[PDB]
């Protein structure tokens, strides 16, 4: 039928599967997916039930799955969605599990080394919406991209990415926004950013957003060197981070 209001246009891409459901359950992994003893295992997950819109695109032969995935990733982060998990190739675990057990679409099954997966939480006013993107290039040399929105029927918990996800995405995408942080820097989100900046001590960032000054100093007081953090100008409600190469 129609695209998700938040995604880009993949030039000449065709919708090959469209699904909607007013109350479907999704269990989106927050880490690699595998089977142990035949039972499904996720290294962290988010379960939510709500209105599901799932779009399956087949890309034109001229354009790679990885290109469309990067465009989708760039667009969701520029919409200031908080990233929750991002992974490429074998880091995602099994394509068969993602295709079948998570998205329930066997067309998405391909070589593990050709996949990519992203999960984000949309910014308020859509803060109980999750958007998931999955890309694959298959042996038939065709390229597909799955994009799904789950509007949860109940408010989502406090959902945070790992420090590894934050660092990796800051370098793969160059920037990202954390749009579900408290206005006063503290708690889980301050802890996450502190642990992210101790995992790579050389990386430098520019902070912007309505309370970016407050964040930088909370971080200085948790031990981050002030030389590592510059300040930008944005009115976005969240904390925006920009990789200073």
Author numbering: 24 to 268
Quote from the publication.
The protein was found to be monomeric and the structure consists of two domains, domains 1 and 2, comprising residues 24–184 and 185–268, respectively. The fold of these domains could not be predicted even using state-of-the-art prediction methods, and similarity searches revealed only a very distant homology to known structures, namely to Mog1p/PsbP-like and OmpA-like proteins for the N- and C-terminal domains, respectively. Since PA1624 is only present in an important human pathogen, its unique structure and periplasmic location render it a potential drug target.
The protein was heterologously expressed in E. coli without its periplasmatic localization signal (Δ18PA1624). The data collected from the native crystal were not further used for refinement and structure analysis as the diffraction data obtained from the SeMet crystals were of higher quality. The asymmetric unit of the orthorhombic crystal form studied here contained two chains of Δ18PA1624, which superpose with a Cα r.m.s.d. of 0.5 Å, which is only slightly higher than the coordinate error. PISA analysis indicates that the protein is monomeric, which is in line with observations made during the course of purification by size-exclusion chromatography. Except for a handful of flexible residues at the N-terminus, both chains could be traced with confidence. The Δ18PA1624 monomer has approximate dimensions of 54 × 45 × 48 Å. The two domains interact through a relatively small hydrophobic interface covering about 600 Å2. The larger domain is dominated by a six-stranded antiparallel β-sheet that is covered by one α-helix on the face that also harbors the N-terminus and by a mixed α/β structure on the other. Towards this, it is interesting to note that the interior of the C-terminal domain of the protein is not optimally packed, leaving a cavity lined by hydrophobic residues unoccupied. Therefore, we suggest that PA1624 has a novel, yet-to-be-named architectural domain arrangement.
